[PDB]
Amino acid sequence: NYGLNIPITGSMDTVYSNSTREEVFLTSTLCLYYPTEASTQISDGEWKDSLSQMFLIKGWPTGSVYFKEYSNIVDFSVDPQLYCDYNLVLMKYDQSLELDMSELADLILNEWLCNPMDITLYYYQQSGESNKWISMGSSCTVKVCPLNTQTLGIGCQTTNVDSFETVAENEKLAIVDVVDGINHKINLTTTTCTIRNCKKLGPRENVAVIQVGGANILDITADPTTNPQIERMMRVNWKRWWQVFYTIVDYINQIVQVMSKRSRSLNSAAFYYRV
Amino acid sequence: MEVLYSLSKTLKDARDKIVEGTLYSNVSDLIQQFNQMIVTMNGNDFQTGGIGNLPIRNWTFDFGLLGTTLLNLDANYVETARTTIEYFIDFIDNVCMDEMVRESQRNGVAPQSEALRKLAGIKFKRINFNNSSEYIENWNLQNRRQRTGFVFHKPNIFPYSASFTLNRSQPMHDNLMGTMWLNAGSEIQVAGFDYSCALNAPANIQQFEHIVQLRRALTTATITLLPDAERFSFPRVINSADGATTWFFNPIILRPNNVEVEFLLNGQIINTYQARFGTIVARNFDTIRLSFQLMRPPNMTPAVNALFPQAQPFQHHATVGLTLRIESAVCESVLADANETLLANVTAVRQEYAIPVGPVFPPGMNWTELITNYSPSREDNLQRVFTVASIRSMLIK
Amino acid sequence: MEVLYSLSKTLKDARDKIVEGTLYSNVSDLIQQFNQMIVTMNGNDFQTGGIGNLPIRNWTFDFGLLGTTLLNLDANYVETARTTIEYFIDFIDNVCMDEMVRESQRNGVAPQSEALRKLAGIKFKRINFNNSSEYIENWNLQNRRQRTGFVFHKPNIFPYSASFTLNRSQPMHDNLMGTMWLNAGSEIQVAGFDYSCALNAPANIQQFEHIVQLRRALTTATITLLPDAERFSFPRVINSADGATTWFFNPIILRPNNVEVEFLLNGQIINTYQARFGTIVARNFDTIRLSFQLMRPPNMTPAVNALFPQAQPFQHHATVGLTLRIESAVCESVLADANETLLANVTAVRQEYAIPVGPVFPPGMNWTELITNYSPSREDNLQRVFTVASIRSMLIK
Amino acid sequence: EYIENWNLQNRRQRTGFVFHKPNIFPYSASFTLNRSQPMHDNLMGTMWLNAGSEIQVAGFDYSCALNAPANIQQFEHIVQLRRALTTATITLLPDAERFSFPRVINSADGATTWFFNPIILRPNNVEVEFLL
Amino acid sequence: MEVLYSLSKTLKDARDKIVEGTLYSNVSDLIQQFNQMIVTMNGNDFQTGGIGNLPIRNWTFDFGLLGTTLLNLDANYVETARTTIEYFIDFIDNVCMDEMVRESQRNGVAPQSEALRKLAGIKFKRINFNNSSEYIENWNLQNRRQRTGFVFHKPNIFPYSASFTLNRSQPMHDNLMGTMWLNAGSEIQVAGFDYSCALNAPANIQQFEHIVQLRRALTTATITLLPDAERFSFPRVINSADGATTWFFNPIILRPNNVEVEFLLNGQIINTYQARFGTIVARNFDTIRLSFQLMRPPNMTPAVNALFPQAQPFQHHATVGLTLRIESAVCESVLADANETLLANVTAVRQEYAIPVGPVFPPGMNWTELITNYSPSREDNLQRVFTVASIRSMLIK
Amino acid sequence: NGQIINTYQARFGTIVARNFDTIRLSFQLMRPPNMTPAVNALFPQAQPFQHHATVGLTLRIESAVCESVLADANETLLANVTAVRQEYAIPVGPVFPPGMNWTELITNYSPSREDNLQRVFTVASIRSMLIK
Ligand SMILES: *[C@@H]1O[C@H](CO)[C@@H](O)[C@H](O)[C@H]1NC(C)=O
Ligand SMILES: *[C@@H]1O[C@H](CO)[C@@H](O)[C@H](O)[C@H]1NC(C)=O
Numbered sequence A: 001n002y003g004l005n006i007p008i009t010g011s012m013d014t015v016y017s018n019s020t021r022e023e024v025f026l027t028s029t030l031c032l033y034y035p036t037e038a039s040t041q042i043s044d045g046e047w048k049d050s051l052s053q054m055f056l057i058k059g060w061p062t063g064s065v066y067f068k069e070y071s072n073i074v075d076f077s078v079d080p081q082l083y084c085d086y087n088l089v090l091m092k093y094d095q096s097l098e099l100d101m102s103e104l105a106d107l108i109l110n111e112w113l114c115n116p117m118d119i120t121l122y123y124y125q126q127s128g129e130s131n132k133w134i135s136m137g138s139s140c141t142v143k144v145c146p147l148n149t150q151t152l153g154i155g156c157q158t159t160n161v162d163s164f165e166t167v168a169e170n171e172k173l174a175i176v177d178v179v180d181g182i183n184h185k186i187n188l189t190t191t192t193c194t195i196r197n198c199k200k201l202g203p204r205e206n207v208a209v210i211q212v213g214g215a216n217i218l219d220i221t222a223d224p225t226t227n228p229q230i231e232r233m234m235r236v237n238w239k240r241w242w243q244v245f246y247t248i249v250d251y252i253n254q255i256v257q258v259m260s261k262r263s264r265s266l267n268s269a270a271f272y273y274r275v
Numbered sequence B, C, E: 001m002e003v004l005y006s007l008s009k010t011l012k013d014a015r016d017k018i019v020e021g022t023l024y025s026n027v028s029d030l031i032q033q034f035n036q037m038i039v040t041m042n043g044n045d046f047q048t049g050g051i052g053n054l055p056i057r058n059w060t061f062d063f064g065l066l067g068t069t070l071l072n073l074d075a076n077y078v079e080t081a082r083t084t085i086e087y088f089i090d091f092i093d094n095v096c097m098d099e100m101v102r103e104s105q106r107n108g109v110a111p112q113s114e115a116l117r118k119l120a121g122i123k124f125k126r127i128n129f130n131n132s133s134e135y136i137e138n139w140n141l142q143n144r145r146q147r148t149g150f151v152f153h154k155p156n157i158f159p160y161s162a163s164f165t166l167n168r169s170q171p172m173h174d175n176l177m178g179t180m181w182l183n184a185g186s187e188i189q190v191a192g193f194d195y196s197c198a199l200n201a202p203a204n205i206q207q208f209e210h211i212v213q214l215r216r217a218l219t220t221a222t223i224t225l226l227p228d229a230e231r232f233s234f235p236r237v238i239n240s241a242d243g244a245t246t247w248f249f250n251p252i253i254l255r256p257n258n259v260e261v262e263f264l265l266n267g268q269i270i271n272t273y274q275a276r277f278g279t280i281v282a283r284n285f286d287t288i289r290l291s292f293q294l295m296r297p298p299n300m301t302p303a304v305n306a307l308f309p310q311a312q313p314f315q316h317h318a319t320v321g322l323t324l325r326i327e328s329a330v331c332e333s334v335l336a337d338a339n340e341t342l343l344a345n346v347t348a349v350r351q352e353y354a355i356p357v358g359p360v361f362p363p364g365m366n367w368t369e370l371i372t373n374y375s376p377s378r379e380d381n382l383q384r385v386f387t388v389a390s391i392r393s394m395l396i397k
Numbered sequence D: 001e002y003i004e005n006w007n008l009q010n011r012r013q014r015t016g017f018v019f020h021k022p023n024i025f026p027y028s029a030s031f032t033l034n035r036s037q038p039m040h041d042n043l044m045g046t047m048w049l050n051a052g053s054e055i056q057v058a059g060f061d062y063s064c065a066l067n068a069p070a071n072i073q074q075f076e077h078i079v080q081l082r083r084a085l086t087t088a089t090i091t092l093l094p095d096a097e098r099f100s101f102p103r104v105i106n107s108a109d110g111a112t113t114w115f116f117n118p119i120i121l122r123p124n125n126v127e128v129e130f131l132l
Numbered sequence F: 001n002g003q004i005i006n007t008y009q010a011r012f013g014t015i016v017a018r019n020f021d022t023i024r025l026s027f028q029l030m031r032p033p034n035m036t037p038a039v040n041a042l043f044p045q046a047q048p049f050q051h052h053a054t055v056g057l058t059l060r061i062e063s064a065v066c067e068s069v070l071a072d073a074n075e076t077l078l079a080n081v082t083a084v085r086q087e088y089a090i091p092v093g094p095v096f097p098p099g100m101n102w103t104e105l106i107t108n109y110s111p112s113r114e115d116n117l118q119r120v121f122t123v124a125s126i127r128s129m130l131i132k
């Protein structure tokens, strides 16, 4: 009940001033998420200590900087937990991972509200353009079968899963969209992969996705028409992971200046599970 | 003070009508008025000034009268006329400056500047010539109070205030909604805006409203209402509500559909004009209520479609504006104008001699806080100094 | 009606010149006028009102003359005069109010308001005192048919009108060319835009022209001409001509090169100014032709070059513009202004008592529809009611 | 008043004319540039329009006071009236409007045109000095 | 109205001084006043009533003059005088009851009630006797423009408000911090509360401020300031901000430290009182700013320590309060009090006779809604009806 | 003024109107419920529709009284005025239409036009008293 109904009256001439304070932590925390390729190429192990020591001169006290190491992009896509305050995610671009990188970017860069989907019992729809179905697990093979108004599968027989239509096969993460307003019968390997009916709230701005490799390929917005260039959708050019980390450390003030510590959540999950 | 105004008026008429060669028939009545002024000011010792840097001056009057039997005035006559008129003009100038600088909280209408009180005595009522001017006539009609009125061209009734209200906001200020406005002089300029272009409003229509409370009700105001407020139709970077950060505003303007303006006097709807720009009229009002709407355009050519997306970024922000200018008006209580130099004259005489700050007026006669807080003491004391300035400007200008 | 003005003038003079202590020399001729007025008006019964909510009232005059034996006016004189004067002022106020609410499709200038019609009779022709104000002077001249002239400050000769024309159009509205204009009050803001920035135009010069017709021929008008029409110099989303879709307008303000304004009377060149901004003068005119040119700049820094390509998209849309204020003018027929409160007075008096829509005037008496169709009958009625309102404002404010 | 002043001046005396919105200023639209180069990618200076009774003056900086001392860039514009006014009422507002939308402006020499893409910041610690 | 007050005055003086056995020296002047009042009123004819259930009544005066041929008044004289006086008193009672019920949004000061309007004429100016009472003296000092003043005991200036703000809130309503206030009549009682007793506030001190803006400026007000706002010093169950739920409030009183009450006029500070209690004086003011502070005690007995934890429960809720009484005041305008009965009399007349709800006053003369919006027309009408009510109460109780 | 002043229902021949600014002729076309074979073949239920059913109304205004002045079939006032203008080739004036064609003069019959028309018609009457 933060009184989010009355307007706030400002003034257009007074003044440029300072932000007072906030007492829930001594200071914010910066938080790198890098792939194991970085460590293997660096071939070190005091290097986290050295990077912390170098952030210290940039002006981050010791306990504030944390490092996280995911196996690779697909293995990070499953339940991407951002246990932290200013998250940077170094995504090494590789050919054929364009859609998966886009999936992960659309997942973390935006604020999702997810409900459960009991696939075995009910059919499902999509309320609007902001409603996706997000499936995660060790392997998802989401076979959908759209039904007409009479609960008769069109282009598929509800009793024969072989005729169902595979929108995404064997993915660690799948943000599947289907035509809005049509019931669907879903089928996916419930032992390994789970699925959720997720609506998209506004954007999440703890997270900065740094594409380390190729050209601008991230398309967070599922709309084909729009392809916005968010300020947090960073793109750096690389030959060596030391150079990458040094650039991040050197320019970290701008990295956090383009983000906001405010849009943080209690739980570290990438969505609000609303049952 | 009627005596003061009549003194100034008869000196003006003496300087004008008493000219070489004119018929005595043209100026006989003014001659008798001038003689009355001379004989009823003779022997009276006045003192003026003594506040701030304003010097203390003594005026002693012993002047000759003006002949009557002549049929045509000549230079031998106008020379005496000017020799007296210069001294008298100086006297009224000093008296007016004295009364302008003086001030009070209790019984502001009454005359300060003890010279003016002495004039207000009963001996000097024989000078009262005729109270013709707008300000003196309003003064008399107010003194024996009937309803009266001052007519102003472009009255600076609003206090200078530029501000904004944010109905929707978040600590990154990327998707806002609200109303910017600037009330300055006789201009209102109010601009509502949606960063989402009314994407999720009911029926894709967003309502904007803005209430402006005049400190004094205006009468028979001619007003000009136009769309597309211009001061809020270019990119800006605006300090936050409290100065924490600064948020970017990138307007793209649509027309305000179904605009309406209601002119209110003590609550009730005195006038209401719907979707009617150009010149309008408010017969009597104390509050203005501008209510307009931003409607998402249902049909979008591809350029504007690219401008307004369903997604979150919102690189451009829809705006709908209104300008409302009080071209002329009639008010019970005195106000500054673009047509009359009363406020300028009083403030100039105060600043010239560095009068210490008094009880009621703001420091430096700042019009903004002199119209923001306009209590009756402020109002009637302001009327007194303004009418004295009106008297002075008849001669010293 | 001349007698009505004489009544108002003599009451104003009585209220201003019959004051305590004023000599009888100052007011002898006024007393003679007042006594004549009393003698003429005694033993008459006027009836005022009966239209809309304006209440019927009956006026009966039995007032004694004013004394003449007093050398210098005293109190009791003033109270006797005032108890007469408030009654007379109320009568004149009601007469003017009842006259301002009546129209006549045929013979507008002739009086309405049976009270005023009775005043027009031969009995009351001995009240004719003085015809000094501008409006009564022009009324007398019209009855004495010859040239009439009303001097105006910011005359709102232009009916409100915002609109555009497209000389090159596509259903996608991506490569447009044409003009937009706001004519409002004394403002003409015109802006010619070209989306291609004159690629294929002859010599990269695109000619823009705008024709404005005045409903009355203004005379000796000072006009402020500036470049860069502001209102059409920022991004905008404009409904198409038929309202089907909306197109996007993204200005880049080039200089208007070799501008040329012609002021024309009966379609012949009366005044011409090329590349001459600032204060100009139109001697006597009835239409304004504003012709300017969008000239593509041959030399460009890379920023400008990137703005204006030779290709298809045209993200930024070149434009030029002119602003033309009529600061003051002289017209042969009565108009609203930003200085006089006559339109406000008449409209307020109509709205106060809810006069039903009359034969001649538009509903609510809105100046845009009144001036856009300003037929001679409407001009007659407007002059009559404006003169009456100017008469009323002498006493009532 | 005109014959008043005629007489008062013909017989040397102090006098005056009251004007509503006098056009004391000659028409002048111009600019000065304190930082420049032939590319016109990085400029700093002032644009101004003196017109009738208006002075609309807009300082501008392409770097938004990046390398300026203390992130503050000072702008000053002096305008010298041909004849001194007296007891004037003036209206001062922010946001010089005519220089708050995109423009293409010839250079001082007129050789090439440069693009000007304003973003209206708020002028701070403004000062107005009336001199005689 | 001066005539009406003089009529009531002389009737009261007749009823009080024309008693059996008085000298004629006692009542000579009064008998002359009464006799010429009889002469003035004889031959006239008034009508009263006609609005609501107030019955119409026609008053015709034809009375004999009171004798003057006695030495000591006897019972015959007194009986005849009473036969006259009872009728005249009934007439005055009806005139005042007719004048009280009538309103006019336009020109509220002027007389409604055609009976009193006729009394305002020139024939009845000779009845004027003396204007001694406070209300009529202020009426005269406003008839001419001079500073009036009404002395009030416990003035009902504050409109009835009883409400809170929560500067910290959440749905469970378990940790709150804010202010409650009751403004009523002459009382302000404001109590700031904090559930955490200022744990995490800067320097263990929580600031509270309460601004109350009088609708009219008081003068020479005697005020009584005490700590410990009574009404917010016990358990309560209060509806939520929107009424969706209710929240428990369990005060424990702390002494408000560095309390500071400020009386302000037109923004600027007039009087300051820091850590002052008992009776104080506000010289002249328009708003009151009551600031105080909840300071967590540094040293704390184990009992109070148990009262205030650092954890979440907060079973007892710290509060600091102020009480602020206006014992007396002087006001330019007119207000109801705990002493005068004029508001009660006017409201009683309207309720008695079922007057329809008029334009200006609210229904039932509801004082809270009357003082909330106290426009100048409403104030004018209120002063008129109040002085009429006092005139009535001179004779009728 | 949009107020039904007279109403005649299925009444032909001569009728009267007290005072009227507008005439509303309403009628109907009823398919004949019974039909001789000739008319039946004339009107088929198919598409072609080779003969088209119609229903008409004629309305002469035999005489009237008008507050304003009009031309007539009985009065030579308009003819006199127009002939006098044509015989001497008067330049087209600011109020009357070119040639004084009655159709365009009564299509727009503003009060100024009515005033001038009444004046010239009365002068024509005065002249026609003598010069026929
Ligand atoms: C705001 O922060 C700046 C940072 O350099 C500091 O210099 C300034 O003093 C701060 N404000 C105040 C009021 O101290
Ligand atoms: C998915 O399809 C397989 C057959 O390929 C079936 O065995 C399984 O039960 C289906 N999953 C669900 C949740 O019905």
Ligand SMILES: [Ca+2]
Pocket (backbone or CB within 6 Å): A155, A156, A163, A164, A165
């Ligand atoms: Ca299939």
Ligand SMILES: [Ca+2]
Pocket (backbone or CB within 6 Å): A099, A100, A103, A171, A172, A173, A174, A175
């Ligand atoms: Ca995937």
Ligand SMILES: [Ca+2]
Pocket (backbone or CB within 6 Å): A126, A128, A129, A131, A132, A177, A178, A179, A180
């Ligand atoms: Ca979808």
Ligand SMILES: [Ca+2]
Pocket (backbone or CB within 6 Å): A219, A220, A221, A222, A223, A224, A225, A226, A227
């Ligand atoms: Ca996309």
